Amino acid sequence: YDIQAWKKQCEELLNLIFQCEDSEPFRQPVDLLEYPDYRDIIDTPMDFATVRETLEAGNYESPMELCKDVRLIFSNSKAYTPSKRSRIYSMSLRLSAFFEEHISSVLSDYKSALRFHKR
Numbered sequence: 001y002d003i004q005a006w007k008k009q010c011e012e013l014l015n016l017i018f019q020c021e022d023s024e025p026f027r028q029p030v031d032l033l034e035y036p037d038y039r040d041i042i043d044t045p046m047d048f049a050t051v052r053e054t055l056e057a058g059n060y061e062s063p064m065e066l067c068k069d070v071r072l073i074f075s076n077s078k079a080y081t082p083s084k085r086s087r088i089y090s091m092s093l094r095l096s097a098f099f100e101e102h103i104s105s106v107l108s109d110y111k112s113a114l115r116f117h118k119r
């Protein structure tokens with residue numbers, strides 16, 4: 001019922017995501033010299049370095065907020081991709097599955113801890 005445990009759990013999950021070759025495209029912002037139209041399509045850029053920095057700054061209040069920003073990485077890839085069979089989009093789907101498989105217990109435990117705190 002540790003209300004704070006989600007933060008280190010998310011740090012370790014981000015470490016695992018940074019070890020995944022599938023995170024390569026999502027570790028830093030999109031360069032506009034490489035993708036000049038990116039911001040015509042994507043209103044809110046997001047990447048895993050930004051998520052990690054936000055977490056380490058103490059600027060997430062809950063793992064739900066972190067989850068929303070991670071899910072934005074993946075929705076941005078789905079919105080930007082010209083094809084559902086693109087390399088970078090295909091990498092996003094595997095990384096998303098990995099992320100969802102691991103974040104589920106982090107969210108469940110946090111929400112359970114908060115309920116216990118308010119019992």
Ligand SMILES: O=C(NCC1CC1)N1CCN(C(=O)c2ccco2)CC1
Pocket residue numbers: 024025026027028029030031034035076077078080081082086088089092
């Ligand atoms: O340049 C990127 N990353 C930073 C570079 C890797 C170090 N991008 C990742 C996001 N992105 C897509 O999701 C996408 C879908 C289809 C094609 O690209 C655009 C390219």
